[PDB]
Amino acid sequence: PTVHVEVHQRGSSTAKKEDINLSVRKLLNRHNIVFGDYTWTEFDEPFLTRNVQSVSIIDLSACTVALHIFQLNEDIIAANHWVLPAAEFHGLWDSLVYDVEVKSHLLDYVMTTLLFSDKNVNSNLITWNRVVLLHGPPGTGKTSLCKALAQKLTIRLSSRYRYGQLIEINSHSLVTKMFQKIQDLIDDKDALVFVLIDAVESLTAADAIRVVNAVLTQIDQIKRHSNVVILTTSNITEKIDVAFVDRADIKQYIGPPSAAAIFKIYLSCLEELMKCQIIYPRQQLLTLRELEMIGFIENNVSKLSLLLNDISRKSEGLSGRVLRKLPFLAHALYVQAPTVTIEGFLQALSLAVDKQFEERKKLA
Ligand SMILES: Nc1ncnc2c1ncn2[C@@H]1O[C@H](COP(=O)(O)OP(=O)(O)O)[C@@H](O)[C@H]1O
């Protein structure tokens, strides 16, 4: 069995990754027994304190332990460009809460695609290509998940590629000049190059006819390369569109979150405010599973978690975008103070949610 361990090497570190590889594996033999996903940020060994920010075990270490040691990179006309792994995308993957194994299977699909591409599997005999489509209603994290997926793959494939690239083309819009810069990045075969075309449905809605055909033909060229992956998103979940998108061999529906997911999302927001001490004092909050084990009995330990559970349920229907914005509105409208008890914040969050749906009915 294989266990994955992501090692965040400090930007200021100059040590070889083989040295870090041996240090981290000594640390794991020390602790050796693991209960689940655990992350060390403080170390006793001074070589690790110097060169490693965090060691995270991610989903008894007699399994096969795979280390992924990476450094974050701290820093083209109509395109955004990041060198991967990018500091901007650090923590994005974990901030996206989907139902079980949406992100897992998506990672595995692209992993198999890259494996098949790397071994020159004949696609006439086994179906695969280099295009990925996430489709969903707007605000479900599709663009973020593409970026987070590109970051995960670069980190997980650090043995085959030395770094990654992400080019985000802004659909709202020389075309030869942009794809020349993309080809220069592809020319470096030590790099896994991701090209992200957001909301491709706007292309078929948009003189405008020539620009589209120019981009589709440029896409057809770069996808001929082994180190290229094309990520696309569509905010219309149902409709058919453009060839390379409709023929994408990986299609994933991304819908709005369930009440179970909303609960986790809110929990992550409340944890963050407690970490920053905007919510003070800190209090213990229960997960759904923990609530289910006590049959949802209302007592001092559970009262506030039950209240959050009920806020999550009347939040059903809202997108993730709105959900992670509501704690900001809750604080700005109903707290307006540097500090607030969790009781006060949950009440504020509840009002903010009601306000969202009042605004909704006015649009109806
Ligand atoms: N399922 C989710 N869980 C947590 N946060 C989410 C989720 N979906 C969206 N968000 C938040 O909304 C932000 C913007 O979403 P975005 O990726 O632009 O949506 P889309 O591209 O699908 O329109 C994300 O960066 C994220 O913080």
Numbering used by the authors: 19 to 77, 90 to 105, 119 to 216, 228 to 260, 272 to 429
Publication text:
Recently, the AAA+ ATPase TRIP13 has been shown to collaborate with p31comet to promote MCC disassembly and checkpoint inactivation. p31comet acts as an adaptor to recruit C-Mad2 to TRIP13. TRIP13 then induces the conformational change of C-Mad2 to O-Mad2 in a process that requires ATP hydrolysis. In conclusion, using a combination of biophysical and biochemical approaches, we have demonstrated that TRIP13–p31comet catalyzes the conversion of C-Mad2 to O-Mad2 without the global unfolding of Mad2.
We subjected human TRIP13 E253A mutant (which was deficient in ATP hydrolysis) bound to ATP and the p31comet–Mad2 complex to crystallization, and obtained diffracting crystals. Both contain an N-terminal domain (NTD), a large AAA+ subdomain, and a small AAA+ subdomain. TRIP13 G320 is located at the hinge between its large and small AAA+ subdomains.
